[PDB]
Amino acid sequence: MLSPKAATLAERSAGLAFSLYQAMAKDQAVENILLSPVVVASSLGLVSLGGKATTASQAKAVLSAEQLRDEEVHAGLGELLRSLSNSTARNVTWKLGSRLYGPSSVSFAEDFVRSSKQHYNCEHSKINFRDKRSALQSINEWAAQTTDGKLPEVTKDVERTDGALLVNAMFFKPHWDEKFHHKMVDNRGFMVTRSYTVGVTMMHRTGLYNYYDDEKEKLQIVEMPLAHKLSSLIILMPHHVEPLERLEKLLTKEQLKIWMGKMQKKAVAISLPKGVVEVTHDLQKHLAGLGLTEAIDKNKADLSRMSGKKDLYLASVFHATAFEWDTEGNPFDQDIYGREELRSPKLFYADHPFIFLVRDTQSGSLLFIGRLVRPKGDKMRDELLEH
Numbered sequence: 001m002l003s004p005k006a007a008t009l010a011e012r013s014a015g016l017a018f019s020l021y022q023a024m025a026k027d028q029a030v031e032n033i034l035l036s037p038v039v040v041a042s043s044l045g046l047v048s049l050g051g052k053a054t055t056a057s058q059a060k061a062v063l064s065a066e067q068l069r070d071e072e073v074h075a076g077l078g079e080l081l082r083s084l085s086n087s088t089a090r091n092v093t094w095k096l097g098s099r100l101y102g103p104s105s106v107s108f109a110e111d112f113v114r115s116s117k118q119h120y121n122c123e124h125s126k127i128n129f130r131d132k133r134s135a136l137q138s139i140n141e142w143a144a145q146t147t148d149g150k151l152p153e154v155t156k157d158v159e160r161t162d163g164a165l166l167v168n169a170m171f172f173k174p175h176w177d178e179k180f181h182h183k184m185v186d187n188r189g190f191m192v193t194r195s196y197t198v199g200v201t202m203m204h205r206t207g208l209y210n211y212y213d214d215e216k217e218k219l220q221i222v223e224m225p226l227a228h229k230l231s232s233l234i235i236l237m238p239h240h241v242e243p244l245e246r247l248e249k250l251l252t253k254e255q256l257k258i259w260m261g262k263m264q265k266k267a268v269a270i271s272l273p274k275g276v277v278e279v280t281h282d283l284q285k286h287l288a289g290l291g292l293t294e295a296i297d298k299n300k301a302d303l304s305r306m307s308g309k310k311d312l313y314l315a316s317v318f319h320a321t322a323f324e325w326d327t328e329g330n331p332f333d334q335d336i337y338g339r340e341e342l343r344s345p346k347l348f349y350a351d352h353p354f355i356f357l358v359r360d361t362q363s364g365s366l367l368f369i370g371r372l373v374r375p376k377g378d379k380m381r382d383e384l385l386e387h
Contacts (some may be wrong), residue, residue: 002363006070006079010065010365013080016290017180017369018253023286025248025371034279034321034370038080039096042120043283043317045077046166047295049120050112050306052362055294062291066125078119084367087230087360093173097146099123101139101165106307116161116255129161143169143320150322163315164303170321172368173260174233174358176329180205185327186227190273190375191241191352198377202351203274203327206342210263213346217377219247221259222268224347227330230361234260244353244371251355268346283317323370 002010017037024030030219041063048070060066065073082247088094098123102108108124116122125142129135136158143154146165146169154167180203190200208224210221218239236259238247284296292314294300350372 002083002365003079005068006076006083007363007365009041009065009073010038010363013037014253014366015064015147016040016044016062017366018251019250019290019371020283020286020352022248022251023289024281025244030281031373032277032279032371033281034277034323035319036084036168036170036172036368037366038077038320039098039319040283040309042077042081042098043166043168043319044118044287044292046098046122047076047114047292047314049074049116049301050109050303051295052302052304055300055302055307057175057180058167059296062287063362071190074119080365081120083249083360083363083365087226087228087362087367088172089175091319092177095147095150095171097123097143097167097170099125099142099165099167099169100306101125101127102307102312103130103162106309106312109308110305112306125135128164129158132158132161132374135161137167139167141281143167147171147322150276150324151278152321153278154284154318154320158316160284163298163301163313165176165316165318166314167316167318168320171324171329172358173324173326174231175227176226176327176331177229178205178207179329180328185274188271188351189276190377192374194241197380198375199380200273200351200375200377202271203273203325204269204271206267206345207267207332208268208337208341208350209268209270211261211266211268211346211348212263214259214262216319217247219221219250220346220348221263222270223260223263224270226305226358228302231367232359232361234357234359235348235350235354236356237348237350237352238381241352244355244373246356256357267342269342269345271349271351272325273372274325274327275352276322277375278320278322279320279370280320283319284314287314287317324366 048056150171188202189197295314303312
């Protein structure tokens with residue numbers, strides 16, 4: 001559970017994440033989305049830490065933290081970052097690294113290096129893009145080591161090679177409160193579009209889950225608690241195989257509350273795609289839209305508290321995440337509700353794009369927002385030699 005200052009920041013980060021999600025969903029190039037509100041927030045907090053004047057004020061403004069003091073903002077976000085581990089088993093089902101890359105010519109201020117590592121646990125490194133292959137190799141190897149291989153490649157190309165490159169590498173694996181059986185796994189087809197279908201491995205389970213079927217808006221919503229009901233995962237999926245654009249319009253902080261209230265603990269037969277979903281986002285373009293125009297502009301940016309000198313702007317903000325869907329979770333006692341309690345269950349068969357949200361139960365803060373559109377897999381051909 002959170003302090004009042006951190007709780008208010010948590011709510012604003014949740015706003016930024018939905019605002020970014022909607023902004024990214026509109027981009028037709030974006031397929032999967034995976035945002036971690038508190039890690040997005042800490043990127044803005046890092047700008048207010050190593051910035052001066054309108055560059056740092058815009059960072060506090062995007063955080064709606066103009067009333068809070070500078071040290072208060074850095075401690076509140078710092079409390080938020082430590083609270084992510086609180087309902088996630090640190091270093092085994094949740095790994096996170098944050099590193100700032102500056103050109104070889106630049107040297108970071110020891111005052112900034114101390115306070116960024118203190119609150120944001122930020123790492124600092126220099127990188128020269130003359131050898132572009134060795135610059136990408138240094139970033140990708142760092143993110144791979146941070147996630148112990150789950151996120152092998154953050155990016156295949158760096159566009160802006162003359163500023164600060166903030167990189168956030170993550171690995172999160174939701175640990176179910178009632179585990180799926182390790183053998184209730186088979187191969188199915190996931191329909192990306194009505195025409196394109198990829199071969200995926202799926203995990204299946206039937207249990208009691210809070211569920212709502214919106215027959216009017218043609219969608220299903222299920223909540224799947226995680227280990228010790230300390231956090232819970234919600235999934236919103238349309239009835240037909242359709243683009244999530246329609247469903248995304250309905251996705252609001254208020255509509256979610258409505259849907260949540262309409263749920264009831266029914267027997268549901270859930271089938272989810274099993275595997276790792278690797279997603280990298282360069283939030284630079286989208287952060288400018290939310291009100292961070294100075295830091296991202298080479299000429300307006302003042303990042304003197306960071307390098308003791310100007311000629312340094314926020315070139316990129318990579319938000320790379322490896323989200324693993326696996327069967328593992330806490331065990332459940334057999335003859336808890338009896339096999340006659342799951343007699344005729346509702347069908348939540350996730351074989352087409354869906355939206356999902358992880359939420360902290362002790363603090364109420366949003367842990368993740370995202371959507372699975374194209375899971376990892378090769379297009380399976382139109383066989384249809386029925387079973």
